From a paper:
Cg6PGD eluted with a molecular weight of approximately 116.8 kDa, indicating that Cg6PGD exists as a dimer in solution. The monomeric structure of Cg6PGD could be divided into three functional domains : the N-terminal domain (N-term domain, Met1-Pro179), the central domain (CD, Asp180-Arg441), and the C-terminal domain (C-term domain, Ala442-Ala484). The CD consisted of α-helices exclusively and was associated with dimerization.
Structural differences between Cg6PGD_apo and Cg6PGD_NADP were detected in the residual movement together with the loop. A NADP-binding site was observed in the N-term domain. Among these residues, Arg38, Ser39 and Lys42 were crucial for binding to NADP. The guanidinium group of Arg38 established a stable π -cation interaction with the adenine ring of NADP, and the π-cation interaction and hydrogen bonds that formed between Arg38 and NADP played an important role in the stable cofactor binding of Cg6PGD. By checking our Cg6PGD_NADP-binding form, we found that Cg6PGD had class I that is typical of NAD(P)-binding proteins.
Author numbering:
A (entry chain B), B (entry chain A): 6 to 484
The structure:
């Protein structure tokens, strides 16, 4: 007569999640502040499994088997803190509050401190895949005490996406580690979509291909190493004809990316952690620029292009160019992921989480928009070398870069000569050529700062800080 | 027997600032929590002018002529709030608390609300030029109530940098406007230093010039449109020989800028405001990458370069290439400033500040690391069009871009073919080519997001939001 799991918040995400639990053989307690949403779920979806509805938090908590597991699925921020307090007040020692919402990981850290203190357990659970994932099988990223997973894990494994028998959930780490890895996942999604956008742009405006032909190229690419959900749905979007006009649907869509989106959080965290996420960063900046409606209108046809050429005048074969774009897309995808996994290691180190990157690449293979067989290469890279300094240095990926790099350079040159924007492709190659470099112009920056501000520099041949007496005899002294 | 201005916090920045006030004929109250610093200022510099040293906040406040003007120069964050509260409790209605520290503008906004509600005035003042500017003439960016500038303005004008008889201080706007434009100024400084670094890297590793020769090139550029303090000091740094090794000083400096600075705050604000600051962003990312010591050590000689060429094999004239790099530097500087001024506009609109960008380009000509005669072109651009959509569209600058664009494309092509990193040069050209684009891949992103999440899109040819039934008959409905 008791539920093993409960959901508070029965808007579409929490209702879909409750249904998932119930379809997979769990008894599920459900509560919503407004009872009409609870009544609607029972009325329209009660045949999907065993639900225990409650009108009050006290009734809801009383319906859960100890140790009690309540997932919150409400509005992020103040509304989730309100429900955490209501559950906290009603629960016993050893009970488990789970926020499944899209929390700021710093909110989850603060909540885990306040709730662990109250004698309760707090889990911040990132849930991927949006409404469809919540209903049919998400990737789940729980952070909190490791002993919370003993009672919660088997429940989450019952609803998670399954890939080759492996549920897309495992314990990520303490406190905010789950919401953190979910946030980085969101930023990676932006980069994956932007590198596809850039490939599309070159195939259309350099190779002269219409959307229906580009769809067919993407389906061919999707049979090879790039194989991915995002490339699969890209072909379906490029194939779609607008019934009203007969034009490709993409050609009647307003080309301004929804300014609603959390990819910016990923880049803010990378800026704080000292990680160069050029790929996610340029993908976010590209969405922002697309929305600058009045600036784009004022710019159109008014900035000098310079002398441009075209593939025919360059003597470039269309088939060779299309393959070069594929290889630029793969290289740029690989840089964006290497940077994202750098951000995961930096966040883990900063927060003492011991995040295992193999767990992330494993559970992102199902119920995620970014799912692709590429992720198995990330698992294998870290399996081979738990302390790998960059995904680019994995023996498999490094050997792949050997075959990509000539194409990648040709795409940057060619796009530039045709006046076509390629922000993540170009920025990824400058980042790559920066990691290759023996000496970077940061040495000059250190010298400039010592000149104007006496900020001091380190030396390659001696430990310590040094200063040149710029305003004086320009001798070097110790700082 | 009363001071017209006071300084709280007598570490080097505040001691320098107090000395500046005193050298310029003001009577200056000085106070530091630790009395030993007050004793030290009086002992070492009391001859420079009329100081009134106090050991306690109450004596300090009693030494000030009403309406009292106290400038706080202490550790940013909680320490600044601690000193604000101690002054506020000791002061009378109409008194003026000024924070001259490197405040987060959101902290200034909060402080101005709290302190104004108590019948005091709060000013957040950005002070540029570091320790040297505090002593010898800074750029000063005060935000707070306009009436505050009437008693404070003449004191700030007595110490500010002066350019052709114009003091580098004016009232910026309400509450946080001052600390906000200082934060953007800090980001711009990063971009100015990075574009100089990229030019240096190309002249050294593409044109085969040694640092002493590059120093002579920068001095010649400094005679033309690029004329700047940063280019002047760059030639002095590149001329410098390390006595101990005989190598160029730059060659014995550790090429790691790391994360010792606040340029990241500029990018985080840009991300929240929806502004594509690709120049400042890539500059900050480049500093972060330079500091990844273990990763760079692991990457050296392990990432495939691809087939590279050189200027000789390309048939490129060295003098033509050097001028092309100058013009890439100019174009990329202009893009970084255009984006920073877009960030200033977006911040001013979000916060109802009515920031006049002419004020900023006027007062950054003195006592700022970014000072350059280029800033006059920004004043003139906004003089001609208060609602200018981008600095790129100013008639003078658009005319300049007609002469820069062919060079700029050649530099991205050539750097790419030689395997040299140019993150701001290349990202600035993708941004430029993105403003030139009729249609951006943002249309494909809108289609993808509608496919996987039913996120809806807008149409170019009629009003409202639409959804294509991707899982069903792929008909379109209004949303
Ligand atoms: N659809 C998407 O694109 C997407 C993707 C991922 C996640 N999400 C989900 O979106 C939700 C965010 O909510 P929203 O603001 O957008 O929708 P909403 O309908 O305004 O709120 C959702 C739920 O929050 C509850 N709630 C709000 N304030 C509360 C309070 N103070 N005390 C108790 N319950 C409270 C509501 O209860 P009432 O019914 O009583 O109002 C409702 O059940 C999260 O659950 C998140 O998981 C969105
Ligand atoms: N190189 C630099 O450090 C540098 C460069 C840029 C800007 N600044 C400027 O210098 C200030 C920052 O100082 P810092 O943090 O770098 O150095 P710090 O040595 O940690 O402290 C700087 C000053 O803050 C005072 N202070 C700290 N906590 C305080 C508190 N709770 N109550 C009152 N006074 C307090 C100290 O007083 P005591 O002597 O009593 O400790 C000292 O006068 C700001 O005004 C900033 O704009 C410094
Ligand atoms: Mg039935
Ligand atoms: Mg299932
Ligand atoms: Mg292969
Ligand atoms: Mg580890
Ligand atoms: Mg002076
Ligand atoms: Mg000229």
């Amino acid at each position: 007569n008791l539920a093993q799991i409960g959901v508070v918040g029965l808007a579409v995400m929490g209702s879909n999640l409750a249904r998932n639990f119930a379809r997979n053989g769990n008894t599920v307690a459900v509560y919503n502040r407004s009872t009409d949403k609870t009544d609607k779920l029972i009325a329209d979806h009660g045949s999907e499994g065993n639900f225990i509805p409650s009108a009050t938090v006290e009734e809801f908590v009383a319906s859960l088997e100890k140790p009690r597991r309540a997932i919150i699925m409400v509005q992020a921020g103040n509304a989730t803190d309100a429900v955490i307090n209501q559950l906290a007040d009603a629960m016993d020692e050893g009970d488990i509050i789970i926020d499944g919402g899209n929390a700021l990981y710093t909110d989850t850290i603060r909540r885990e401190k306040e709730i662990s203190a109250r004698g309760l357990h707090f889990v911040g659970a990132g849930i991927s895949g949006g409404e469809e994932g919540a209903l049919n099988g998400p990737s789940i990223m729980p952070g909190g005490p490791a002993k919370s997973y003993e009672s919660l894990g088997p429940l989450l494994e019952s609803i998670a996406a399954n890939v080759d028998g492996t549920p897309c959930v495992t314990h990520i780490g303490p406190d905010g580690a789950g919401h953190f890895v979910k946030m980085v996942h969101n930023g990676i999604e932006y980069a994956d979509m932007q590198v596809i956008g850039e490939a599309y742009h070159l195939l259309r405006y350099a190779a002269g291909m219409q959307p229906a032909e580009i769809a067919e190229v993407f389906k061919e690419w999707n049979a090879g190493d790039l194989d991915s959900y995002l490339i699969e749905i890209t072909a379906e979007v490029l194939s779609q004809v607008d019934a009203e006009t007969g034009k490709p649907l993409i050609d009647v869509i307003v080309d301004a990316a929804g300014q609603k989106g959390t990819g910016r959080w990923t880049v803010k965290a990378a800026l704080d952690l000292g990680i160069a996420t050029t790929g996610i960063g340029e993908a976010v900046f590209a969405r922002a620029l697309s929305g600058a409606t009045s600036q784009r209108a004022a710019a159109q046809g008014n900035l000098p292009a310079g002398v441009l050429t075209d593939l025919e005048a360059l003597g470039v074969d269309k088939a060779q160019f299309v393959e070069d774009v594929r290889r630029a897309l793969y290289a740029s995808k690989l840089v964006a992921y290497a940077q994202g996994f750098d951000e995961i290691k930096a966040g883990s180190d900063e927060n003492n989480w011991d995040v295992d990157p193999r767990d992330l690449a494993t559970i992102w293979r199902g119920g995620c928009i970014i799912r692709a067989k590429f992720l198995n290469r990330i698992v294998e890279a870290y399996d081979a070398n738990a302390e790998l300094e960059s995904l680019l240095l994995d023996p498999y990926f490094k050997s792949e870069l050997g075959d990509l790099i000539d194409s990648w350079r040709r795409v940057i040159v060619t796009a530039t000569q045709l006046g076509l924007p390629i922000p993540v492709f170009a920025s990824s190659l400058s980042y790559y050529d920066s990691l290759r470099a023996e000496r970077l112009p940061a040495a000059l920056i250190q010298g400039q700062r010592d000149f104007f501000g006496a900020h001091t520099y380190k030396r390659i041949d001696k430990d310590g800080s040094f200063h040149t007496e710029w305003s004086g005899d320009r001798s070097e002294v110790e700082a």
